[PDB]
């Protein structure tokens, strides 16, 4: 009776989960958004990556990480030599939350994050990843609690006992943060993202 939970079907099939998410009304965000954006990859993936929400391009492409942030992330994954076939990539909330200016993303509230978390739990349960990479604060707090700071713990192998399957957890920055800033800072941050991805990839 809470959030998206009744919209989630009793199957681990990612195709069926994604179809069902197309119908979710688990919070208000389905109203203005074009469609739900489910994650992508297969259930044998070892590494799950969780961003914050679909962006402008993702909302219309119907897949996660197709915009500039995805291209930067792809460059980081390549530099970490993580095979893109080992990846299931998704977001903490599945409907683009936005405003327009004369589309701009707006932060999902904790309520929206918790409302949508059943989809994320269904994905984690379906994929059974060895490691979950949390890309930025919103994703991290979904799983690690609303007080958690990515800045104080990024690149640490974490395990919290209330997360299904007890996967290793590695929090890092969201790739969108590495698009706007000074070059030396963007280059320094890029190297830290590669580092955090390598930590996650070396689990097991
Ligand atoms: S953001 Fe998540 S909970 Fe809210 S309507 Fe979309 S799929 Fe359902």
Residue numbers in the entry: 1 to 102, 107 to 208
Sentences from the paper on this structure:
UdgX excises uracil from uracil-containing DNA to concurrently form a covalent bond with the resulting AP-DNA. Structurally, UdgX is highly similar to family-4 UDGs (F4-UDGs). However, UdgX is unique in possessing a flexible R-loop (105KRRIH109). Our earlier studies allowed us to propose a reaction mechanism of UdgX, which involves the formation of a covalent bond between H109 of UdgX with the C1′ position of the target deoxyribose sugar concurrently with the uracil excision from this site in DNA.
Based on our previous structural analysis, we had proposed that E52 participates in a catalytic dyad with H109 to activate it for a nucleophilic attack onto C1′ position of the target the deoxyribose sugar cation. Further, in the structure of H109S mutant, a water molecule was appropriately located near S109 for activation by E52 (26). To further validate the role of E52, we combined the H109S mutation (where a water molecule is allowed to locate in place of His ring) with the E52N mutation and assessed its effect on the uracil excision activity. Expectedly, the uracil excision activity of the double mutant (H109S/E52N) was lowered compared to the H109S mutant. The Kcat of the double mutant (H109S/E52N) decreased by ∼10-fold as compared to the H109S. The Km of the double mutant increased by ∼7-fold, resulting in an overall reduction of ∼75-fold in Kcat/Km. Consistent with these observations, the distance of 4.71 Å between OG of S109 and OE2 of E52 in the H109S mutant increased to 5.71 Å between OG of S109 and ND2 of N52 in the H109S/E52N mutant.
